[PDB]
Design a protein around this ligand. Sequence first.
Ligand SMILES: [Co+2]
Ligand SMILES: [Co+2]
Ligand SMILES: [Fe+2]
Ligand SMILES: [Fe+2]
Lengths: 314, 314
Amino acid sequence: MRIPLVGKDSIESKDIGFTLIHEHLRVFSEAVRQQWPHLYNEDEEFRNAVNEVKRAMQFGVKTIVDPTVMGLGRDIRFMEKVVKATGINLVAGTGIYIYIDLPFYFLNRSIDEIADLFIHDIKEGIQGTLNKAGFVKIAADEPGITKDVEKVIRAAAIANKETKVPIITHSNAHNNTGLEQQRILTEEGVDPGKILIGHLGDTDNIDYIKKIADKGSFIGLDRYGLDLFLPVDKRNETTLRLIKDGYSDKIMISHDYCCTIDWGTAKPEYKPKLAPRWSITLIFEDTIPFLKRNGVNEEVIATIFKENPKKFFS
Amino acid sequence: MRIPLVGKDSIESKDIGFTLIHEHLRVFSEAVRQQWPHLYNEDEEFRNAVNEVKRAMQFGVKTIVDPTVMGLGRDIRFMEKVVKATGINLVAGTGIYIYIDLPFYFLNRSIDEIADLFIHDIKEGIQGTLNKAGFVKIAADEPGITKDVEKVIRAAAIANKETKVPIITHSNAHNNTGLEQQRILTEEGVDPGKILIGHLGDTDNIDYIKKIADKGSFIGLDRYGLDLFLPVDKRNETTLRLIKDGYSDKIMISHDYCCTIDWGTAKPEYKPKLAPRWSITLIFEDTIPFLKRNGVNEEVIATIFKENPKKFFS
Ligand SMILES: [Co+2]
Ligand SMILES: [Co+2]
Ligand SMILES: [Fe+2]
Ligand SMILES: [Fe+2]
């Protein structure tokens, strides 16, 4: 029913349980991995993914939603391997991760045939495997809403309307890209409560975060641990005021953690200073205790982690 | 010794014979092929590759150099799946094909580690195999010499100095990119005679082409058949003019034909409108017969197709 799972039968939605809405098992650039496999260690990548997932499960995580898509090196056979090693509910997705331009394949190509690529993964299966896509992922950043970025957004809208699956975004918090995504999707007949505007926790600006929640979409305070974007205690006080002002029905939090990340901007040796305590369980060690002893009940955390994902996927 | 071949041991520069300097067996965007295999037909594109190669060998071609590199879907296994089916000498290369920016992997990574990737392909092998890269391919287009394009050119300079392999370039003929690649490469210690400046046959401007040749580099009259850039009759005029001005010591002629391309601007159905007679044998059907009946003799085309490829790889 409703939500498709990797290496397991489809489950209902209400059966989602405690959910981490935004985590990565591994991300890489497709071109460079395909051309130079000597840069990578698949055993190290598998060992880290398994170890990180199992510890999340120990804290009571039932389901992880992994928005790794084209441009981030989505591998469904890798996803199966860790599912079997772990017993996690894994929700894979479809979509395109870009900041500026599409690959040359998409030259002179219609929004429609891009949407057909998403609708394919949702209905037929990812990479010819039978594991179906449960959501669609789109990105936007500092370069803003470009021609090719918009085409991916409008393609996501069509896939949403025709398969009823929700859409998760990557955005820049300081840009207005998050708001623009919401606007363009809604205009094309997308129910606001089916959109998660991501990386909104990268900013102090509660007013900007609020209006996106007011327009009716889930807000992504989803990069806990990544201190370079915003430190943990800055994020803690932002989520706290949002909960106090009654936005907990729109709040979704995660880590955006990568057990293995490809980019030279984020190699393991830069971890201290940039993101010293960044893991897939950081919110259990810091955020959740902090909120509990600051006057938030566990009905609120059940909203954010259980009820909100449930409404998102139905 | 000297030139490494795909699944064919290795031969001297003297044994290269009649050569096509710039032809593609199949190009595709690495990311979309990895993410959506349903868009592709492995068997058909293999059949297209073999049919064209056999037809090329029939007409007298001994060696084909294929500058499919990162960004164009270099697959060493597909290449050796052909060859075995044909018996063609095939020179594979290394490098990066970009017009603007590198994939995220390269975010704040040095020119030296980009060079190491090219050096790995030449000295160690390509994609986990023992087949080696005999040259390095770099690119530039309408966006000009950007920041990341500069990096790859400089990494190519290091790989050449280290390994003695020559450099094949892609350039835009109407914006000085070819001259600029030559400038940077030679400044950085590369022998001008070891660079092929690509796609110079796309232009009417004869003064510009001579500019590159006078600085001692090979000139790429290498897109015969692609009428949308310049029709065959115009190219033949330019080719003959340079031959009669005595530039055949710098002239290299090819088709840039792809048996399979995934670019939406290069759909098979677009051929009769954009590049009607475009195939791997057009120079045997049009160019050479045109030249012969216009005065140019057997040693002049032997210089272009045997001797110049020999010098290049010496
Ligand atoms: Co993101
Ligand atoms: Co080219
Ligand atoms: Fe992410
Ligand atoms: Fe080419």
